[PDB]
Amino acid sequence: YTENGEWAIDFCPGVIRRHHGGATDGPGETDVIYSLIIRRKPLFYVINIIVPCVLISGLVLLAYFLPAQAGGQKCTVSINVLLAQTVFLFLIAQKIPETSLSVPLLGRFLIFVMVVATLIVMNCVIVLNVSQRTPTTHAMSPRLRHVLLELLPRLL
Amino acid sequence: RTVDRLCLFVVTPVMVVGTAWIFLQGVYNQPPPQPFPGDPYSYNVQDKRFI
Amino acid sequence: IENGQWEIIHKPSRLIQPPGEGQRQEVIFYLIIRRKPLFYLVNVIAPCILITLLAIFVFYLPPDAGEKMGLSIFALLTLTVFLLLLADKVPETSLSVPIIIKYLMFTMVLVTFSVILSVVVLNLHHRSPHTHQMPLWVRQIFIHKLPLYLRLKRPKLPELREVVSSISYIARQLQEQEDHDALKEDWQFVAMVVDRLFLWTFIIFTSVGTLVIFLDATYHLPPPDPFPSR
Amino acid sequence: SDWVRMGNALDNICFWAALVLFSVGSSLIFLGAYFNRVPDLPYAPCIQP
Amino acid sequence: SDQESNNAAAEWKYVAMVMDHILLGVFMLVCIIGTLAVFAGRLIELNQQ
Amino acid sequence: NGEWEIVHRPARVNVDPRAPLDSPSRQDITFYLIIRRKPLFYIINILVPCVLISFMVNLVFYLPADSGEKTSVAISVLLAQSVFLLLISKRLPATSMAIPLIGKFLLFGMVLVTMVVVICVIVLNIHFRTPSTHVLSEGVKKLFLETLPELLHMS
Amino acid sequence: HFPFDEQNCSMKLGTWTYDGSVVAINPESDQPDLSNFMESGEWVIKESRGWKHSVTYSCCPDTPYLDITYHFVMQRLPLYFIVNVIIPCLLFSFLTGLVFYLPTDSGEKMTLSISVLLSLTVFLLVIVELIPSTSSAVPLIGKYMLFTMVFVIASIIITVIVINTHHRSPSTHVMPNWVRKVFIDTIPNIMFFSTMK
Amino acid sequence: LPTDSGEKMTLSISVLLSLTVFLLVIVELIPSTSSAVPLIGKYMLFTMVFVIASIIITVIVINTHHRSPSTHVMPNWVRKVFIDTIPNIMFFSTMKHPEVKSAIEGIKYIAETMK
């Protein structure tokens, strides 16, 4: 026996079933059912899809450490991670089952990280909007100033 | 800025006209009225050729 | 029923005798067929030529625009897309490399070197004057000798005492800024000269390599005879 | 400068928020698989070791 | 003179920023309205079945 | 059929006069189907997106040189066109009788986008010139600051 | 209505060479037997039914032609298409509008919008491989895809116009009076008004 | 690539994007099995981790470059490690009407502002 490259056979019980022996049914029927309980070996998906996707999706957190100026490229890092995630969506569409009884873990993780990246893109946009305000267009909102510069260090 | 404006007014009409030409060849592409060129017959059940 | 991708050049047939009782003759029908490559010219070769042209034109982009990296690297990304396009069409054997794959890898190497040399040019351009001292030989080569060959001509009472001190300090600071700007201009001119040298070198290498590969492809003709002398 | 420092403070709090969201969601999604082992059935293994 | 030039430029920037605020509102509203106008009719129809 | 509409459907008895009577190729009956493609799928999914994206490269002329995002827009349009070319490459045979109409448009658009990228490079080169690097001649000023803006009705 | 579509598919059965005057077929039951039906991971059979039909042609008034047609009304399970197609499109549609909250001085508006457009263009691969390539009608999913593409396109056009407006200076333009009246005077009065005139 | 170019993230993220697009080529060409990691797979994952690490460290370098002098104050250990010791191994250069009185104070203010 040579094990399948992707599937390990963990269990394989057999059972002889008998049914349709009722008076209305009439003649009894029988069959033999074997249940191959098989386990996927996920190494290919781990190496080729999941680990690269995890790292590339984690790159969005680096946007918070880039400067909020013209040359910061904060939005460069976030939206291009989303583009890479779209490429991974194309990659994963070639492999996942096409049924709709439930959602696979791979697809759920990809959609989750895409939603997180979208939220962080919005967050970077907001931080850039706040950071480059100048007196020639915006007034100094003292409420947000007090909230962020005075109350926030006290909370921390 | 002047070079950019001139390049707009030169390049954009060329793109529009070329795209329009290329897609107008296809939009007006239709099969001929008769299945066989040179044969006027339509080969339709309306136009029966009684013997 | 003519094939849209293949042209039949020769179509002979031959009786093959056994090598001189269990021996068997054969009748072999040969089809010598030439591919008609218009699809690959439209879908692969022309985009590669255009991307190569953009890789050349990166070196004319000024460093202050801040756009060399984007252009060169997106050219590389587009070439990767065309590698994905070719992945479904090319043969999978390993006895030799298709010439189209050779051309694609030549183009990718060219774009990689365009990225590398653009990085070098930007490093020269943004060089800090105070931290970096220009060595003299750099001056002699890239500011005096090479611009001639590349056709780059570089153009060309306590109050009163306190006031005097302030004015003198302001003049001193502006003179320091002038010297700093002069050294910065020297570094930027060196970067420009190096960029022009790379532009000409890239044009020459691109033209020579493309011409060599295209002549190798063009002069690969089908055999005049199905059974040439060997 | 005041605007820049407000933006920096926003970035600082939001980084921790985003890190917590990313880590917790990914960990839950993959721990769903970690608790998805084949059940310990009352049968001998299919392949005798 | 540079100050007058800066004032005129700042007026142009203010006009652009007001346009951006209006367009942000319009595009978010368009996102919601298009998403509804596409799917909601069929989803409501299936909800009634 | 969901993609093909039958326009003509003739039937014909074909007799080859040159063939001998004892040849199977002497006679046949041919039923022809002239079928027109219903192009709605390709229109909606390929052609309108590709055409609009290609036309987007013209906005770079209205983008100021100080934005720093001209060549990025143009080369990104080229990348999108290459993606569309990858899309088309799977759907048609690699025949040589003609270039497909979508293929003709895509080649035309990639060529134009390449010229637009080159024009953007030249425009950026002109924009960032300084006295320390270039000399601005009076003839260039006369042509590009007074005559052409008046002809082009520029503000 | 794809992927929320309902499909009524039939199975017309009949004796090919025997007419009703020699061989007669009758349904065993009003409905097909689904007692041993395996669960489908993509469709739900809401209704199933068999109907017998007899057709008599005028040229053959003595030999009726019989058939039994078994129909199956089926509703697609749309979860796969919701997760893999609709949600990414919704995310792109949401990301489209965020460029208008980006400052022009950030130098990243075109980066954001064009990257969203590139994401949609790459996503077209997923859509066309997953969506059915038929021209009988435009699917709902195709309508949404075209909507998102067209409005990312519109956002790019308007963003270029906005950036052009932002960089104007008295060395290039002179502001018309109507622009001043509309944008500096009237509109902020009917807005939150935190902005300084 | 200097930080002042404003293109570090462009280069690094676009190299990552090219590698991600090339992953489609890799999965198209090499066989997909989980019996063991192929040598191509090991090299691919090494390149991916290499690019990710380069991006992370580039973000750190950019953050270091842009540190403001007011909010941030340079610790002594950073100065001793990077300005003093390491460059010895390399080769870089280490680094009486009121109106008249009002005008005088204005000149002094300009000088102090530039200071």
Ligand SMILES: *[C@@H]1O[C@H](CO)[C@@H](O[C@@H]2O[C@H](CO)[C@@H](O[C@@H]3O[C@H](CO[C@H]4O[C@H](CO)[C@@H](O)[C@H](O)C4O)[C@@H](O)[C@H](O[C@H]4O[C@H](CO)[C@@H](O)[C@H](O)[C@@H]4O)[C@@H]3O)[C@H](O)[C@H]2NC(C)=O)[C@H](O)[C@H]1NC(C)=O
């Ligand atoms: C892998 O797959 C195999 C095959 O599917 C699994 O083994 C089978 O598991 C099913 C349950 O999923 C089990 O079905 C049960 O059968 C018994 C026996 O049925 C007989 O007796 C009952 C009366 O006792 C009669 O009602 C019936 O007519 C008959 O001949 C049922 O008692 C039992 O009912 C219970 O569970 C139902 C839900 O499943 C519930 O609705 C009901 O009220 C009651 O609580 C089941 O119907 C099969 O017998 C198993 N064996 C075979 C040979 O199929 C195996 O478990 C799977 N492995 C894993 C790890 O999931």
Ligand SMILES: *[C@@H]1O[C@H](CO)[C@@H](O[C@@H]2O[C@H](CO)[C@@H](O[C@@H]3O[C@H](CO[C@H]4O[C@H](CO)[C@@H](O)[C@H](O)[C@@H]4O)[C@@H](O)[C@H](O[C@H]4O[C@H](CO)[C@@H](O)[C@H](O)[C@@H]4O)[C@@H]3O)[C@H](O)[C@H]2NC(C)=O)[C@H](O)[C@H]1NC(C)=O
């Ligand atoms: C879709 O494709 C089918 C083919 O698969 C096309 O059908 C062909 O249509 C053409 C034009 O009608 C036909 O060509 C004509 O054939 C006639 C008969 O030729 C037979 O007899 C001669 C000997 O007399 C044999 O050598 C020959 O092999 C045939 O057995 C000719 O008489 C016609 O000639 C007349 O028209 C030409 C026009 O150029 C004049 O020059 C002549 O002087 C004369 O007036 C003509 O050659 C062809 O035979 C058809 N093929 C088949 C298989 O039937 C459909 O037209 C096409 N549909 C489209 C494109 O819409």
Ligand SMILES: *[C@@H]1O[C@H](CO)[C@@H](O[C@@H]2O[C@H](CO)[C@@H](O[C@@H]3O[C@H](CO[C@H]4O[C@H](CO)[C@@H](O)[C@H](O)[C@@H]4O)[C@@H](O)[C@H](O[C@H]4O[C@H](CO)[C@@H](O)[C@H](O)[C@@H]4O)[C@@H]3O)[C@H](O)[C@H]2NC(C)=O)[C@H](O)[C@H]1NC(C)=O
């Ligand atoms: C497409 O593919 C087919 C099949 O491979 C090629 O057909 C072969 O063509 C080659 C030449 O190109 C033939 O080789 C030549 O055979 C001649 C006769 O050899 C026969 O007789 C000897 C003696 O009895 C036998 O041993 C042998 O098996 C044959 O039965 C030789 O006289 C030729 O000699 C020439 O080439 C040799 C090369 O080493 C020189 O040393 C000689 O001086 C001389 O120049 C030669 O060997 C071969 O037999 C063909 N095969 C068949 C089955 O017909 C087509 O050529 C190829 N088409 C292309 C590529 O265009």
Ligand SMILES: *[C@@H]1O[C@H](CO)[C@@H](O[C@@H]2O[C@H](CO)[C@@H](O[C@@H]3O[C@H](CO[C@H]4O[C@H](CO)[C@@H](O)[C@H](O)[C@@H]4O)[C@@H](O)[C@H](O[C@H]4O[C@H](CO)[C@@H](O)[C@H](O)[C@@H]4O)[C@@H]3O)[C@H](O)[C@H]2NC(C)=O)[C@H](O)[C@H]1NC(C)=O
């Ligand atoms: C999916 O597609 C299938 C097939 O197209 C549809 O099947 C149709 O379903 C309807 C409704 O169930 C059928 O209509 C009914 O047909 C009965 C039988 O008619 C045949 O047999 C009689 C007797 O021999 C012939 O006289 C007749 O010509 C036919 O050959 C009728 O008895 C029914 O009449 C009853 O309902 C009508 C309602 O209008 C009343 O007016 C009558 O008085 C009476 O109460 C009725 O006409 C239809 O025949 C089916 N067609 C086929 C081809 O199977 C499915 O409905 C569809 N599923 C969906 C979309 O839900």
Ligand SMILES: CCCCCCCC/C=C/CCCCCCCC(=O)O[C@@H](COC(=O)CCCCCCCCCCCCCCC)COP(=O)([O-])OCC[N+](C)(C)C
């Ligand atoms: C895309 C289509 C083609 C281009 C359309 C352009 C449309 C826009 C129109 C361009 C005109 C702009 C004029 C500005 C300069 C005025 C002053 C002047 O001419 O003298 C000075 C500047 O000389 C130049 O800069 C040369 C003229 C412009 C060169 C444009 C790039 C090269 C294009 C070539 C064709 C590319 C073909 C391949 C691509 C298809 C002299 O100083 P110099 O230092 O001696 O100048 C060296 C100039 N050189 C480096 C260019 C040699």
Ligand SMILES: CC(C)CCC[C@@H](C)[C@H]1CC[C@H]2[C@@H]3CC=C4C[C@@H](O)CC[C@]4(C)[C@H]3CC[C@]12C
């Ligand atoms: C958007 C973020 C927050 C979540 C991203 C993951 C998405 C795809 C997850 C989150 C919750 C999930 C759902 C939770 C529970 C169920 C019920 C189950 O019987 C079928 C699957 C279904 C309907 C899941 C489908 C996938 C799902 C919608």
Ligand SMILES: CC(C)CCC[C@@H](C)[C@H]1CC[C@H]2[C@@H]3CC=C4C[C@@H](O)CC[C@]4(C)[C@H]3CC[C@]12C
């Ligand atoms: C935006 C335009 C200018 C680009 C040019 C290319 C495309 C979009 C143009 C060129 C010519 C155009 C067609 C010319 C005529 C018709 C027939 C009419 O009954 C419907 C519109 C339609 C089909 C036009 C729209 C699309 C079309 C094919």
Ligand SMILES: CC(C)CCC[C@@H](C)[C@H]1CC[C@H]2[C@@H]3CC=C4C[C@@H](O)CC[C@]4(C)[C@H]3CC[C@]12C
């Ligand atoms: C990703 C983050 C943000 C949200 C996670 C939410 C959790 C609770 C969700 C995500 C996916 C969900 C699972 C998706 C599908 C199924 C299969 C179904 O037959 C039973 C429920 C079950 C097992 C769900 C349970 C709840 C679940 C684990």
Ligand SMILES: CC(C)CCC[C@@H](C)[C@H]1CC[C@H]2[C@@H]3CC=C4C[C@@H](O)CC[C@]4(C)[C@H]3CC[C@]12C
């Ligand atoms: C800028 C706008 C017009 C979008 C670009 C439209 C382009 C792709 C053009 C090229 C060919 C055109 C088609 C050609 C022919 C027709 C006529 C009629 O059957 C309805 C419209 C229809 C089907 C056109 C729709 C638009 C179309 C697909």
Ligand SMILES: CC(C)CCC[C@@H](C)[C@H]1CC[C@H]2[C@@H]3CC=C4C[C@@H](O)CC[C@]4(C)[C@H]3CC[C@]12C
């Ligand atoms: C309205 C725009 C801005 C956003 C939504 C996308 C647009 C392009 C979509 C939404 C509905 C679509 C229409 C829906 C149905 C039909 C009828 C048939 O002839 C096919 C094309 C046509 C006419 C479609 C053309 C494209 C369309 C108008």
